[PDB]
Design a protein around this ligand. Structure first.
Ligand SMILES: [K+]
Ligand SMILES: [K+]
Ligand SMILES: [Mg+2]
Ligand SMILES: [Mg+2]
Ligand SMILES: [Mg+2]
Ligand SMILES: [Mg+2]
Ligand SMILES: [Mg+2]
Ligand SMILES: [Mg+2]
Ligand SMILES: [Mg+2]
Ligand SMILES: [Mg+2]
Ligand SMILES: [Mg+2]
Ligand SMILES: [Mg+2]
Ligand SMILES: [Mg+2]
Ligand SMILES: [Mg+2]
Ligand SMILES: [Mg+2]
Ligand SMILES: [Mg+2]
Ligand code: NA
Ligand code: NA
Ligand code: NA
Ligand code: NA
Ligand code: NA
Ligand code: NA
Ligand code: NA
Lengths: 196, 123, 66, 144, 54, 120, 227
RNA sequence: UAAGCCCAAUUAGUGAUUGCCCAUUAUUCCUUUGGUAAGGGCGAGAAAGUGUAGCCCUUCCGAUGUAGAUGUGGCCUGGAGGUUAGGACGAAGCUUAUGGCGUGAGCCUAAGAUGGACCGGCCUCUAGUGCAGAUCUUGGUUGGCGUA
RNA sequence: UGCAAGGCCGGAAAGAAAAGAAUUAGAGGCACCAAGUGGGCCUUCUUCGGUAAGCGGAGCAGGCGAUGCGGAAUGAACCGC
RNA sequence: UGUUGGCGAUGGAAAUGGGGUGCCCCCACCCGUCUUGAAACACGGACCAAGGAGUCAAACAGACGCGCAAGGGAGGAGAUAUGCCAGUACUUCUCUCGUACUGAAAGGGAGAUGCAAUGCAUCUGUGGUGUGCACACGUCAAAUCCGUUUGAUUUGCCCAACACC
């Protein structure tokens, strides 16, 4: 007997294989597992790790955010070097709040019809990951991007709404029903909006 | 045809795992059921009781599924089934299904003799 | 029908350990402190933000020009 | 599908995931939302603050059609213009015309930066929206 | 142990379900395609009868 | 447009050529030289293929899929010592040389044994 | 065939370099072993002369305090207090008849004093250290337990010009060198057999006629029946 | 003249070291199974691979458990969409000192000196889908007993 | 141009010596969803009530419950594991 | 990794594994249950066959699969292939959830930078700071088949995210 108390609490929960039913996703995973195994770059390892994730953990990104971060990188870059390739493991959606964008090369798993049209009209190219594996087999001169996760309604619902310092929404279908007692000082009390 | 040689087969255990106390009741079958009684002696692992199946009783993977003749069994139903066995001669033997009739059994046995494919229940 | 004991409680508390405190540089809010100093601190922070914006603009212009 | 349920995994285990000590019994806490003030008070008070009480005036015969009033923003105004007219648009000359009440909107709000000058016909407008569109180069015309 | 769920208002506390003691109060739509076919056939017949009037 | 990798992903689990009896997976494919259910030997979906078959008398016939007339099912396969057979196969598919060599030897031995039992 | 030719040329170039590295490591190990043997003999002789010089004049000689201890666990894993459990876990004695080397300073002596009914310990000798490294020495390579079989593994594991052979490890452990912690942390805990011939009483101190506690340099005979 | 009590030894004042008996413990060897796993490859043999009859080879560590949770190219039953097959030269059902395979749930062959018309495997879909006990329900039987 | 507060700029750095001068089968942090349980009992030390008790009430830790195996001839909890 | 004998010459053989029954030595309290505690002088328990217990609907939530995305999607109904076909193919208008919240209510309603103090001017743009993947530029170790790897760190921009404003 060996004393190994609390040794199962060190185990980590990882995924290691995909639950997706998409044959094209399986083909992409087949390519990038090989690349991550046989290549020394960290770009391939990160991309392979993100292809295995679930749909909820691959949030969509926006064309306006792509344009803004690319410009902020470009202001401090030599005038003779070429702009990088924006890479997102996810979907690229359009923005009606930004009308004119530069010419960029973007690679993604999926494009909206409007996003594709906007990019090509501005003068760029929409690439696929098998094309990227042939342009940049190691990922040199790329910009790896992620989409936004907070601001989702589920995240804003997480928590208990009636403890001090808590600003999460309750689960309720009638908006005018849960006000009053515990939410106004005129009633018994009001839960405190701040706590150290 | 002769089979490919392998290591000796060991067979950790030969006796079967039978249910607790099935010898006293005619209606109980002998197939294994896991005992879940709170006071069960078999479940509590007393010294003189019968054993329960584990993963430790598993058999060596080099010789798993190999029959005493040295082959492995592949079920066949007609003459055309032998043509996909004709190439893995020394690995697999064919087992004619129970419901194939005498008329077809004659043809299957003749063809297997011509092709040099071993039959586990031939003739 | 009413009994009280502290027998298993230490073991239960240490199963997932006693977690240590948060470092003092995190959650370092200033709400509820002395208002006269709080107001002056706010003014200084505003000036600092303006200065940071100006410094970045100067850096950009220098890089572009040379 | 019945073949994916937990009861198929539990054939042979007597208690079905409810225990030998505290069994599975009919209604061990009451029926429905009973006890929200006595023995379910912690649940109610910590997850649903504000369930009990009264607040405000009444309105005996509410009709929503007279209260209809949807809104749209300046940086969103480009959804209501076609692509060709948007390309043809330019401040100082001939501008496209947008009819909010025909597109399904009533009030124009002023969040953001306007991406194209135009003439907007709206039932309502806000101070900032009016000022911003006038500065951009368009105009807003009240309709009914 | 009711955690953080909504407060339910499902409204099903009258004898709507038909059982050995209750007639029920339900309405199903299993005759929807048959009735649609019947309506169309009637309209075609009526147009044929009143021809040439619209 | 639709590649062999995609097709293999599509048919790996159910096909009319996959025989799963007992716990063993074999292949009914007439263009398989082995019987194994793998992408290398699945000759009905590969772009190029070659299979060794027994012919009348003691002849050995090699059937070759060149890869140019695919999408024309009536022109997909045109017919044609063990070293000679292996050299014939290696023109189309180098990774099918050893199995074709062994298959030619086995076909010759089967023919000889059949002639023996015919004389007897 | 260009790729195959390049591969075989590179392999033919690599084999000879491996042979040369083996040849060099052998000579380095030989030289270090010879010098260590000379140092041990010189130290012993110097102590002998000093003791004789004091004894002739009628004074006394005080010896340098021991610097290294060897600790083994003699009780199993059952009914242990939380504090002593944690001390044994920190000392890496989680099974019965596990053995380690520790520094005999104040922070470690005050730890050994608190788990006394569970351990036996003492001061090892060169023969004991050598036997425990050569017979039952294993390393931590990629988190695995690997037996020591040549000097190349030692060199690769430690990556330090002061530790390239097994005699380096023995010297560091025996003399409490500057790399004592590195050498002992890079090893798996020693797993020994029960003592042939038996124990005395695991429930009493060695002074009372039992087994646990500090037994000075008499631990060597105890370990010689376990290694 | 202990086979009792209190001390003390290990073959006895002869000279280095351990009298001997018994564990689901320790050390070591073989096999299985799982990893927060670690490396290598791509005359019979090799599939770029979570899970199989595991793609192939090497290596290290753990393995009990009531209430409870989860996983399984894990087993079984009635029906539906497909695919591949069997049967008057004998289907389903039934019998067993009929063996073989699987840790197991179970699967498969043999014999019937049984039967006389239907039915198997694989991939999906579906449900009134697995029994030893509820003073369980219905039908049959039984010791007491050739007794009172 | 002293003290307080927030920043920018530049420098040093046995990155923690020597004096018994740590050690680690030593990856830190953050969330979401849900079960069973809510009759306990024994022992070592510490104890309050009670004449006492295989009695009632507590503090610290270890056990049984949920667990066999090797010993005390036998024993839930003792000794070893 | 070879060497020397026995049995085995095609049988009603020999051998090796299974299976069946008896015997010897050793081991071994009766199941299910509730209970702190059951082998219990604690309840249920003569035998066999067939039957026999987490299911259907509806509201909400979290995780996972799929389609589209600042939009998504009906439903009811119609039209004609259509007169085998309760299916499949097609559809204007509308409706609903979302893109904006807040107040008891009358009501109001969210960009940045610079200059000034319902102000004015520009519009390729993270409101700022701290900690922060990958990529780019330098530097230093270890190992090396000498081609490169495995590590560390400096600076630029920092994506997601968290803390303070
Ligand atoms: K068996
Ligand atoms: K209680
Ligand atoms: Mg938002
Ligand atoms: Mg029981
Ligand atoms: Mg009032
Ligand atoms: Mg509760
Ligand atoms: Mg709870
Ligand atoms: Mg009635
Ligand atoms: Mg003893
Ligand atoms: Mg277990
Ligand atoms: Mg259980
Ligand atoms: Mg049915
Ligand atoms: Mg029998
Ligand atoms: Mg049922
Ligand atoms: Mg209990
Ligand atoms: Mg909202
Ligand atoms: Na029990
Ligand atoms: Na309960
Ligand atoms: Na039954
Ligand atoms: Na409970
Ligand atoms: Na209870
Ligand atoms: Na019960
Ligand atoms: Na019992």
């Amino acid at each position: 007997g060996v004393d190994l108390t609390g040794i199962s609490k060190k185990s980590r929960v990882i995924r290691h294989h995909t639950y997706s039913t998409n044959p094209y996703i399986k083909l992409l995973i087949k390519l990038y597992k090989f690349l991550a195994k046989r290549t020394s770059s960290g770009f391939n390892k990160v991309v392979y790790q993100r292809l295995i994730k679930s749909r909820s953990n691959r949030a969509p990104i926006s064309l306006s955010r792509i344009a803004v971060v690319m410009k902020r990188k470009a202001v401090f870059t030599a005038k003779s070097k070429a702009a990088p390739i924006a890479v997102v493991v996810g979907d690229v959606l359009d923005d009606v709040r930004m009308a004119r964008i530069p010419a960029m090369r973007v690679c993604a798993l999926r494009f909206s019809k409007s996003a594709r049209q906007s990019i090509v009209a501005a003068g760029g190219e929409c690439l696929t990951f098998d094309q990227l594996a042939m342009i940049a087999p190691t990922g040199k001169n790329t910009y790896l991007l992620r989409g936004r996760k907070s601001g989702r309604e589920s995240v804003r619902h997480f928590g208990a709404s009636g403890v001090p310092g808590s600003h999460s929404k309750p689960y309720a279908t009638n908006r005018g029903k849960e006000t009053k007692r515990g939410r106004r000082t005129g009633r018994s009390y009001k839960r405190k909006a701040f706590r150290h | 045809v002769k089979p490919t040689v392998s290591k000796a087969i060991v067979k950790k255990r030969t006796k079967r795992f039978t249910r607790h106390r099935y010898e006293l009741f005619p209606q109980l079958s002998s197939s294994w059921r896991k005992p879940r009684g709170e006071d069960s002696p078999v479940r509590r692992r007393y010294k003189g009781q019968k054993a329960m199946p584990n993963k430790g009783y598993g058999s060596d993977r080099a010789t798993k599924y190999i029959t005493p003749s040295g082959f492995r069994n592949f079920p066949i139903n007609n003459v055309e089934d032998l043509y996909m066995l004709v190439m893995q001669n020394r690995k697999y033997a064919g087992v004619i299904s129970h419901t194939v009739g005498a008329r077809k059994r004659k043809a299957i046995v003749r063809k297997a003799m011509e092709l040099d494919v071993r039959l586990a229940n031939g003739n | 029908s009413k009994n009280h004991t502290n027998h298993n409680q230490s073991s239960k508390n240490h199963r997932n350990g006693i977690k240590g405190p948060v470092p003092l540089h995190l959650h370092n809010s200033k709400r509820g402190s002395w208002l006269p100093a709080l107001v002056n601190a706010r003014r200084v922070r505003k000036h600092n933000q303006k200065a940071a914006l100006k410094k970045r603009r100067e850096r950009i212009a220098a890089f572009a020009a040379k | 599908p019945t073949r994916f349920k937990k009861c198929r995994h539990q054939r042979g285990s007597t208690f079905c995931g409810y225990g030998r000590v505290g069994k599975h019994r009919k209604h061990e806490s009451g029926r429905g939302n009973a006890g929200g003030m006595h023995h379910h008070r912690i649940n109610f008070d910590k997850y649903h603050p504000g369930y009990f009480g009264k607040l405000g005036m009444d309105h005996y015969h509410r009709k929503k059609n007279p209260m209809w009033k949807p809104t749209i923003n300046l940086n969103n105004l480009s959804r209501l213009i076609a692509a060709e007219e948007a390309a043809k648009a330019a401040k100082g000359g001939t501008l496209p015309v947008v009819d909010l009440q025909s597109s399904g909107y009533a009030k124009l709000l002023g969040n953001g930066h306007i991406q194209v000058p135009c003439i907007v016909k709206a039932r309502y407008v806000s101070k900032l929206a009016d000022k911003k569109i006038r500065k951009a180069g368009g105009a807003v015309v009240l309709q009914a | 142990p009711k955690g953080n769920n909504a407060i339910p208002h499902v409204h099903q506390k009258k004898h709507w379900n038909p059982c050995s003691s209750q007639k029920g109060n339900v309405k199903v739509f299993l005759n929807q395609p048959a009735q649609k076919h019947r309506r169309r056939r009637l309209r075609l017949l009526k147009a044929k009868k009143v021809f040439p009037r619209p | 447009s639709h590649s062999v990798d995609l097709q293999w992903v599509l048919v790996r689990q159910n096909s009319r050529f996959l025989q799963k009896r007992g716990g063993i997976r074999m292949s009914n494919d007439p263009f398989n030289n082995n019987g194994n259910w793998t992408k290398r030997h699945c000759g009905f979906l590969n772009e190029k293929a070659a299979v060794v078959k027994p012919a009348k008398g003691g002849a050995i016939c090699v059937t070759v899929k060149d890869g140019s007339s695919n999408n024309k099912p009536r022109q997909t396969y045109k017919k044609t010592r063990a070293s000679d057979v292996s050299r014939a196969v290696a023109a189309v598919r180098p990774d099918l040389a050893d199995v074709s060599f062994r298959r030619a030897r086995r076909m010759a031995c089967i023919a000889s044994r059949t002639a023996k039992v015919a004389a007897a | 065939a260009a790729f195959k030719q390049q591969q075989t040329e590179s392999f033919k170039k690599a084999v000879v370099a491996r042979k040369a590295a083996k040849a060099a490591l052998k000579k380095t190990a030989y030289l270090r072993a010879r010098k260590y043997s000379r140092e041990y003999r010189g130290a012993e002789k110097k102590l002998v002369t000093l003791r004789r010089q004091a004894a002739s004049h009628g004074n006394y000689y005080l010896e340098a305090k021991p610097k290294v201890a060897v600790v083994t666990r003699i009780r199993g894993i059952a009914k242990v207090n939380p504090k002593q459990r944690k001390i044994l876990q920190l000392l890496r004695l989680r099974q019965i008849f596990n053995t380690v080397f520790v520094k005999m300073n104040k922070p470690m002596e005050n730890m050994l004093r608190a788990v006394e009914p569970y351990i036996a310990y003492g001061y090892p000798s060169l023969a004991t250290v050598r036997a425990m490294v050569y017979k039952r020495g294993y390393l931590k390579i990629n988190g695995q337990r690997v037996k020591i079989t040549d000097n190349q593994m030692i060199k690769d594991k430690y990556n330090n010009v002061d530790i390239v052979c097994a005699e380096d490890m023995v010297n560091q452990i025996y003399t409490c060198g500057k790399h004592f912690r590195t050498v002992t942390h890079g090893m798996w805990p020693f797993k020994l057999a029960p003592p042939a011939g038996g124990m005395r009483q695991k429930r009493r101190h060695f002074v009372e006629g039992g087994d646990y506690g500090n037994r000075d340099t008499l631990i060597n005979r105890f370990l010689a029946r376990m290694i």
